[PDB]
């Protein structure tokens, strides 16, 4: 069964429909807001590691704010809730990549493109790992360029829909 | 794994590509026909409680018409067939909502918008339950208004595609 959990409202002031990651969720301890053009895609894609992590973090936020603190730490809640939050077959995908000696996502580091005048960003992609370390940019710059063109295409589609 | 069951043909005369609910499936004992613009969405959405119920009811219709009556009532057929019919993670979603004291769907009541001149309707949304009863309209009228705008948008898209 497909994940069903939805993200809570966490909009930025200039980022309606999006989702903001507060500082405790990030190593950099910065506040990062992604718009709806990136976030909405999490409800369509079944293969994005970032979106599944986004759900696990959102789950924690809601579970801690909504539920009364337990006596002793219990993991029953996640054992029952997990399939509603993540695609377990992505874990399997990355596991198979690892075994088959193919760069794989270990879920900790992501990259995105950020337009320098508008602040519009892509949905973060996982930075891949191979032979104990991260791949260099020089090993995937063609995928980065493709993401840049996908963003340009989307921007043009937006203006065209404005032409009605 | 994602549901695979498809609905049987149950078109209305003016509702091709849709699906009609006969009176025994409804408390009101009325015949209600929904068009293809609502029904087609059930094959794309993973998160609609109405669509999963629509499949369980359709399943029964086909199982009773196609299979020979059993000796004693057995539930082996559903135990094997269920994941092909519904998203079990919606049950989990509503279960978690309930526990976390968030309005949840108990699958019995739905609402939709119906245009007064054309008869075009939205795909029914679940009427939510909180603290033993149904939420009032005054607690979700903004979501209803959003559904009205989504329908207007779709109608305009249709005419625009007519302009070619």
């Amino acid at each position, epitope marked *: 069964g497909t994940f069903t959990w939805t993200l*809570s*409202d*966490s*909009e*930025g*002031k200039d980022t309606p429909g999006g989702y*903001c990651l*507060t*500082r405790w969720m990030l190593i950099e301890a910065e*506040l990062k*807001c992604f718009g709806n053009t990136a976030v909405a895609k999490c409800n369509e894609k079944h293969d994005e590691e970032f979106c599944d992590m986004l759900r696990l973090f959102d789950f924690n*936020k809601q579970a801690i*704010q*909504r539920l009364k603190a337990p006596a002793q730490m219990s993991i029953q809640l996640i054992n029952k809730a997990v399939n509603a939050l993540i695609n377990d077959q992505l874990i399997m995908k990355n596991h198979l990549r690892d075994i088959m000696c193919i760069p794989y996502c270990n879920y900790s580091k992501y990259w995105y493109l950020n337009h320098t005048t508008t602040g519009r960003t892509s949905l973060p992609k996982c930075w891949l790992v191979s032979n104990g370390s991260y791949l260099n940019e020089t090993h995937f710059s063609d995928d980065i360029e493709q993401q840049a063109d996908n963003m340009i295409t989307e921007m043009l589609q937006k203006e065209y829909m404005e032409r009605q | 794994g994602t549901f695979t069951w498809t609905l049987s043909d149950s078109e209305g005369k003016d509702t091709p590509g849709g699906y009609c609910l006969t009176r025994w499936m409804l408390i009101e004992a009325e015949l209600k026909c929904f068009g293809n613009t609502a029904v087609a969405k059930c094959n794309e959405k993973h998160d609609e409680e109405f669509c999963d119920m629509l499949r369980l009811f359709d399943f029964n219709k086909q199982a009773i018409q196609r299979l020979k009556a059993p000796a004693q009532m057995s539930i082996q057929l559903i135990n094997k067939a269920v994941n092909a019919l519904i998203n079990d993670q919606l049950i989990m979603k509503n279960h978690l909502r309930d526990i976390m*004291c*968030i*309005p949840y769907c108990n699958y019995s009541k739905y609402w939709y918008l119906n245009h007064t001149t054309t008869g075009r309707t939205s795909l029914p949304k679940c009427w*939510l339950v*909180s*603290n033993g009863s149904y*939420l009032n309209e*005054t*607690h*979700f*009228s*903004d*979501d209803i208004e959003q559904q009205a705008d989504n329908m207007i948008t779709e109608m305009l898209q249709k005419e625009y595609m007519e302009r070619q």
Partner: antibody
Amino acid sequence: GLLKPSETLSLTCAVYGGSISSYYWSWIRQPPGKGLEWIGEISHSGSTNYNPSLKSRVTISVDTSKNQLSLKLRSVTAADTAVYYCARGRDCRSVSCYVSSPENWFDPWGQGTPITVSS
Amino acid sequence: YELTQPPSVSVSPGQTARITCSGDALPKQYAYWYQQKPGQAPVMVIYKDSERPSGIPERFSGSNSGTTVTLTISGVQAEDEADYYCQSADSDGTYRVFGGGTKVTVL
């Protein structure tokens, strides 16, 4: 009026109005000579949030048979001397904000009721 | 979570007063500004970062630059002498914080 250090404070914004559905009502206090401090808020669904440092001593509730909004503060140990106010806040007509809302504000204020705590 | 405001400003009549407010959650949260004159309850002056509520004079206008917000009073009148406060929520929402309050005097 005057409260003793171990007494419970009970205030109702009956005069201003309260328990109006669709709004998130809140309580605020201002110790004399100080800035404003948020106490807590209640959604139309009955859900509440409290200032984390105050939370263990405070209850906010709405009596829907009376249409009255009220605050109960336990162990009012002198430091709680302040002017207490209600504010109406934001409205909500969507499911997503029914039990929690990322934001609120205090638009109309309920005049203010000075509370003296002493012995 | 705290918001920082200067404790006071002073403006000659007819000049422009500016009071600022800062904090880390501000790129996500909206600030609201309130005016309190001695003896009364605060009245909201700026709604969200810049919008002026009905009944508030055109002199009052807000703005923001990311982690800071500000209230500008153009053409300050003696009528505007008051303690002005900002508020915003914490990064995760839920907790609402008022700033220290800026005393604006009209000399």
